[PDB]
Amino acid sequence: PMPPSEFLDKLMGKVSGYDARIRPNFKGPPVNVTCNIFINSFGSIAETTMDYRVNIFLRQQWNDPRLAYSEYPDDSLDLDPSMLDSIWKPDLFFANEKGANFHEVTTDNKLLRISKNGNVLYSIRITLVLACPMDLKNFPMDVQTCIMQLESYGFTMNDLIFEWDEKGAVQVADGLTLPQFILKEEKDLRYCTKHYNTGKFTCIEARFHLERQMGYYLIQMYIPSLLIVILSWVSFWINMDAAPARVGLGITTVLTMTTQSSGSRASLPKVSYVKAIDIWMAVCLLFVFSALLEYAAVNFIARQHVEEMRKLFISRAKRIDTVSRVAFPLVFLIFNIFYWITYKII
Amino acid sequence: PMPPSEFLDKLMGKVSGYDARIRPNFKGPPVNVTCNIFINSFGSIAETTMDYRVNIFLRQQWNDPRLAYSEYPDDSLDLDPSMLDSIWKPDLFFANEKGANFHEVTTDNKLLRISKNGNVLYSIRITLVLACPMDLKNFPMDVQTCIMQLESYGFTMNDLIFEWDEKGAVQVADGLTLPQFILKEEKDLRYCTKHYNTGKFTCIEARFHLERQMGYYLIQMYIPSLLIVILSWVSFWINMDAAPARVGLGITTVLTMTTQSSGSRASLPKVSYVKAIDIWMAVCLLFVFSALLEYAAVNFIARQHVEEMRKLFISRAKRIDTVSRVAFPLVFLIFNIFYWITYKII
Amino acid sequence: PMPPSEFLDKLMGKVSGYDARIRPNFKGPPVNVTCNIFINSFGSIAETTMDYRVNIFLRQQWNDPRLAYSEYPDDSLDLDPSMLDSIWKPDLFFANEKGANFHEVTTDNKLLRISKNGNVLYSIRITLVLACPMDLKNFPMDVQTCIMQLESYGFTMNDLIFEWDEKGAVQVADGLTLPQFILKEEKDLRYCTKHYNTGKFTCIEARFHLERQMGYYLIQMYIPSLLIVILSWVSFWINMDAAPARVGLGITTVLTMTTQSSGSRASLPKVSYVKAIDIWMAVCLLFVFSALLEYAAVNFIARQHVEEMRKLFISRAKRIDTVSRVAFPLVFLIFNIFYWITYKII
Amino acid sequence: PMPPSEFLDKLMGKVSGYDARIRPNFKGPPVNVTCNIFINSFGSIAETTMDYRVNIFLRQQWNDPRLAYSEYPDDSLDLDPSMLDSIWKPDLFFANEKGANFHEVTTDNKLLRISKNGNVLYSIRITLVLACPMDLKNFPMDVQTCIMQLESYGFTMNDLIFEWDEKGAVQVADGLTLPQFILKEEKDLRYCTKHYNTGKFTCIEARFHLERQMGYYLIQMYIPSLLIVILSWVSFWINMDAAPARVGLGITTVLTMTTQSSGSRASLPKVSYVKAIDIWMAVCLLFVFSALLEYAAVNFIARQHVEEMRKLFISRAKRIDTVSRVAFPLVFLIFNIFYWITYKII
Amino acid sequence: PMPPSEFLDKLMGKVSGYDARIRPNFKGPPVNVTCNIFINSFGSIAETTMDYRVNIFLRQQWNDPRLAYSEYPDDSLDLDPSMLDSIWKPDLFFANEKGANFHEVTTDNKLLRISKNGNVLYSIRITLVLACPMDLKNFPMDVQTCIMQLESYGFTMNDLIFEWDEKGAVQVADGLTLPQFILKEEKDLRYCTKHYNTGKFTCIEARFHLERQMGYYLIQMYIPSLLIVILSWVSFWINMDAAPARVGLGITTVLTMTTQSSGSRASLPKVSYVKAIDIWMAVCLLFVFSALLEYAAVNFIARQHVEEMRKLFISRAKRIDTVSRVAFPLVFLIFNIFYWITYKII
């Protein structure tokens, strides 16, 4: 017999009237193309530009009666990736590409096989940098949901319809790990049918829940953010007579805590709303600032102190020192409870 | 009958004398091309290079009598995006491109349909990085106006005219949100007819008002910029005898405020004029510097103090301490009123 | 006779039925392609994106009976790199490309020679940026293993099989040096046969062990991380009466050590687990923090001190000063032993 | 009649012997090509790499007798930008390109019109990143001169000559503003004829004077650079008995001034010569360092002070304090005059 | 007669049997191609990636008897750069490209002329980013030697040999200046013949000595690195009774010197060996650390001081103060001599 390359020349050549500019089943029902992606590499999720780089295998399956051969004895004929400009292909595109490219390492990474009944498998490797609106109302304890939509651009709903297959619409790699987030096993599948001034177009998308790993932020901006508050608590255990001791403590600590506040949003987007890490530094900033005002109240009584009425001012300046050793270690603990409970339920 | 691919070969082939290098209605009136864009993604507005990345759908509509078919029973014939090099297309370009590229993810993102009367719709996806002169006279409270002009390069006014359509000249996406700014619903539409040494060319543009969100700057460079001034106010409530207490306070605070001034223009363009954030740090720098000179005036009187005339110098050195507790908390409030009123009207 | 260019036109032209879209030995055994790479340049191994740039010479050898000439008197015929689109080539690709490109400096860097029996050598220069999951459980003393897999995309196992040659499967350059790591002479060779929903494909890979050089981290983040602890030890040799001396020492040192902790993960990925450099700064942070609490215990006894019972409190406040000069210099040495032994065996 | 597309096929087709590989007026005088650029966008002038990005419209005009039509009734025939590979074009190139690209947004931005006498206008949009040797002998008050040369590569002087036109050789945009520098209205026009081992080639260039805007540097690195010196002057108004007051002032200020010196060359090229900003920080570093040595001379006399001879040492230690309040405020003013006069004339 | 474009069609057309896939002098001696480069732009030598960007004019000259015309009366025929795919060209490539590109600004920057005897000149503009192993054993006083090799990829030694010409093998631009380094006039020329598993290939290279300019490092990291040591010397001229004076001096200076050590390797590669700038900061770190231990020895004697034996401890605590004023100013000078002598000979 003849090889599949010469066998398909009768179906993709000048004979049989086959044209790559004509969609299958013309003047009839639209083409129902089913798609399924395979995430190979994931990560590099930046927040300054609010985008993430993904590498998926976009599989496409449809039905073309013009390529339904019945003379070849086999059931699957592989095609050279250099002959993709001869058959019709869906005009699939993403609405959040923001720059993309293919891979042509020694061969155009394309897969093309034709079944006997007319099933055509089209799998390619695409490297996308997808964008998603980052919701940072609770930055250290948020559940991001970055989606990706597959719309049409040249054909409307009556000519091309995208759908998901029931046999693993979205597969995940075996050893796919992320440096900062984690990929949940549950991925939603809903439609995203858009409507413009020209018409209506099909759209398919899949939700991806990306939960953060609190192990990183808990060590860098939570343990040092708590030890600095302890530095302001040790001033109560120091005598009220040493002026340079408690003054230098209430100033060097209250100024190095601002660096922690400025160092908590160094690589974060400039959002207007307040996040969960801005209420942890601001409240702890009040503790390192109230300790400065605490010494300002103790030193103000000692500098004012008549022999009988002045002996009570010394005890009054020391009575507040007996409560500050218990108030702040018990008030900061109350805020430490309302913080790790409200942001663990919402 | 015959499919539209073979039907349009009579209108785009060697027959009928149709050439892609000839504009419609030659030796007559110019081609009136109407355009309308659809902003899909917006943001990433940097200030060091004074540019912003945009992703729009550039729709183009004109009239070509050479493509006015009258035999096909339908009213809209879709075209393959691979056949855009056969018909005439307007030479539309932007005067502020500064690098651009198309999107060819599995298909050239182009839309092409031809009506019966000769209406040709041309919609493509372009990713532009547009530039605009940043007016930073009031940096935290400015209303930026970044525009984009669509000029001609090969045809003059007598051969190609660009205009805006009245049915939604500029559409906005449904869920288009910006991280730093906000997009106003009012967009101006005016002409930008340029004149060069070669001739005159058409030009269409649309204004985009981008108001900032003060919620970000108010927390990072306004709350810490005010608490440092309070650190210089607590020196008045400290006795005038402790030298290392008030000296270290008037130096550590006046030097950490300069870091806030240098940290306020870390990612800003090097402009010559003064902005609204440079007058907030410089005036607050005077308060943290006047407190240093305030102790220099109190300590200078105590070191100079004859038994009757010296008792008044001690009261004089304490009389200024009774006014500094009221002057600065009431003078900084006056500047706090003139600042948030002048920059809220202009 | 005729030159090899005209001699091979009979084997690569329209005659002999040779087609570049047909794999050798069709309807029979699969093509056994042996590959061997030659690493020219290596390094630039970043950790923020977890990727490294490599430049190898990908050699490919297979058997094509359709190109087995028997009339030319020579044994090796060199081919012009501009004629690679006429013969069949394996669709080799990498599963961790993440962007790649060829080199076309004055000539496409391709090697093509055909033997008499049908051996075809295919060598090209590819610049890859390969990714690997960075295991940073012990950051300064880890042995990274970055691999690279060569999979198929268009042909399954029954049509294309990749294998390694026994004569130097992976060669290393003569003067290939790395700035940070070192390349070990032992490189493992194992298979990576994947299984997808479409079928099974061949895969070959080679392990690369990249041991770090501790000479860099030992000087920058280990010598200064130890001298700061010595600054907290000198407070014991200072009299317990000078308040501003020991207070300023226990605060300026405990706050500059946090900068060393924040400066140890400035260019590191945001991992959740704790690494070996996070337990060296945190434990040393306890020493510079216990010295602050040590003075808080000595000053608390002196401020409390009845004529006979008060003379023992002065000796008690000095007895702890006689143990702190020996405890911390001997407790930090114990942690210094358990650290450099546990992380030198695992 | 026939359209210009079919009319010019007789002049650009196989007939008439017109070839795009032959320069006009062969075996005779060279082609005198006149050029004129139009700067659209300017700025982004970095100093680390010593380059600036420019966007100009390169117009080219020459004479081609082979295209001198005499049958068409019009005087200017516009050409499709897709037919630039049919006529001869000058091989113009820049000697300081360092990477460049064109703009192909929906159309190749090319202009091509042919006059009756043979005048051919060629205007294209080129985005260049031009380099210039940065002369930073006086960094805040220099007048940079970045030029751009247009050389030939394939034709020598006897075959191609570039010249400037007298009617606006270099035009400037109407609203072209720069963020840091300013563009002067005077632009020099001189030749740059080079000589290599192959021969001599034509060259045209234009000088661009880029004066800096001192409004930026005067606020960031000149006002804080002067207030720190004032902090060292207030130590003279403090009593000579307070040791921790004047010691902490002469150390915290002398160390934060080094940050201003290191912060003045953070984004500057590593040049060997000294600039005008390195002599302003180094001299001011002497003032904040002489104040430290001033207290070292006052405290050395007080610690040495026999009942009559010791009373003069106290007055001697205070006599220098009466001159330091007048010397430094009058010596720093002398350097402030010689600095803003020498660098305002050269 | 006929123009050179039509004259060379007889030598580059279907007639005469000329093929671009055949090297000259086949079945005979190899082609001796002589090359000579012309460095136009040089600099941008980074150290994090260990690469430098260069822009050279790669001239190539060989002998092709098939192009030896004898009928044209001239001696040099210029060729259009669009016809380089018709003649044979050497497959020259660099072994350290790491990404490269050509320049196509309005014309492919290629030079092609053919002599009567068969001499063919081939000059193109290539922008390379070449790599070299940075030897940083003495960072401020090293002599870097970055080379560039020109190897073959498709032809072995018996088919293509590269050589250097004796008439200026490597030329330098007239006004080529470097921001950091300097280019020496002496450039070595040696062979780099490599040997692989396939065979042996020709190779030509040229050495480039790049000496650093010490004027930059001497001001930024050598003058401030010496003044901080002077701050530790002034503590000896202060009385031994002021505790907060000498304690704060021996801590604030010893901690700001570590920033100079961390600030000396901010943009340097992470090498394991010690460089010449790491022994200048570490030794100076001992001086600012020995001054802290010097006060720890003086204060330890004063706190210990029986009426006759205690008067000698006061003199002993002051005797070391009389030697420290002379020891350190004379010991640091000894290290200052051995440093600037050992690294000025090797």
Ligand SMILES: *[C@@H]1O[C@H](CO)[C@@H](O[C@@H]2O[C@H](CO)[C@@H](O[C@@H]3O[C@H](CO)[C@@H](O)[C@H](O)[C@@H]3O)[C@H](O)[C@H]2NC(C)=O)[C@H](O)[C@H]1NC(C)=O
């Ligand atoms: C692609 O998928 C669409 C569905 O999304 C298919 O369209 C549906 O096709 C049926 C005929 O097969 C149309 O008729 C209906 O038939 C059912 C019985 O199956 C009957 O109960 C209904 O009353 C109706 O007559 C139906 O209108 C149509 N639906 C839509 C929304 O178009 C289409 O056939 C598929 N195309 C191919 C090539 O498989």
Ligand SMILES: *[C@@H]1O[C@H](CO)[C@@H](O[C@@H]2O[C@H](CO)[C@@H](O[C@@H]3O[C@H](CO)[C@@H](O)[C@H](O)[C@@H]3O)[C@H](O)[C@H]2NC(C)=O)[C@H](O)[C@H]1NC(C)=O
């Ligand atoms: C494209 O749009 C232009 C307008 O921007 C159209 O041009 C105008 O066309 C009219 C004829 O239709 C020209 O004549 C005028 O007619 C009015 C009555 O409608 C009459 O009152 C005037 O006195 C005049 O005779 C008019 O001069 C012309 N204007 C310009 C500025 O060119 C043009 O026809 C449109 N082209 C197409 C193909 O639709």
Ligand SMILES: *[C@@H]1O[C@H](CO)[C@@H](O[C@@H]2O[C@H](CO)[C@@H](O[C@@H]3O[C@H](CO)[C@@H](O)[C@H](O)[C@@H]3O)[C@H](O)[C@H]2NC(C)=O)[C@H](O)[C@H]1NC(C)=O
């Ligand atoms: C490519 O390599 C494969 C092996 O990976 C070759 O396949 C093996 O080929 C033999 C025949 O040569 C097949 O038959 C076996 O022969 C042995 C004797 O050599 C006999 O003991 C066995 O019982 C069996 O009959 C064998 O099944 C086959 N193995 C596989 C896994 O396919 C193949 O021939 C190679 N192709 C070329 C073109 O060299």
Ligand SMILES: *[C@@H]1O[C@H](CO)[C@@H](O[C@@H]2O[C@H](CO)[C@@H](O[C@@H]3O[C@H](CO)[C@@H](O)[C@H](O)[C@@H]3O)[C@H](O)[C@H]2NC(C)=O)[C@H](O)[C@H]1NC(C)=O
């Ligand atoms: C392109 O420009 C060059 C000048 O840069 C033109 O060349 C000059 O052409 C004249 C003839 O037109 C040559 O002859 C001279 O004529 C003058 C009178 O005009 C006479 O006084 C002189 O003694 C001499 O005979 C002249 O040598 C030549 N100069 C050079 C440097 O080539 C050239 O003609 C222009 N080409 C075109 C096509 O316009």
Ligand SMILES: *[C@@H]1O[C@H](CO)[C@@H](O[C@@H]2O[C@H](CO)[C@@H](O[C@@H]3O[C@H](CO)[C@@H](O)[C@H](O)[C@@H]3O)[C@H](O)[C@H]2NC(C)=O)[C@H](O)[C@H]1NC(C)=O
């Ligand atoms: C390209 O350069 C090579 C040299 O690198 C040329 O090869 C040498 O060519 C000579 C003949 O011209 C060969 O023969 C020798 O001749 C000398 C007298 O000149 C004689 O004393 C020797 O005993 C020997 O017979 C020589 O073997 C050969 N050397 C090599 C290494 O190949 C070659 O001819 C040049 N090609 C062209 C086209 O110019």
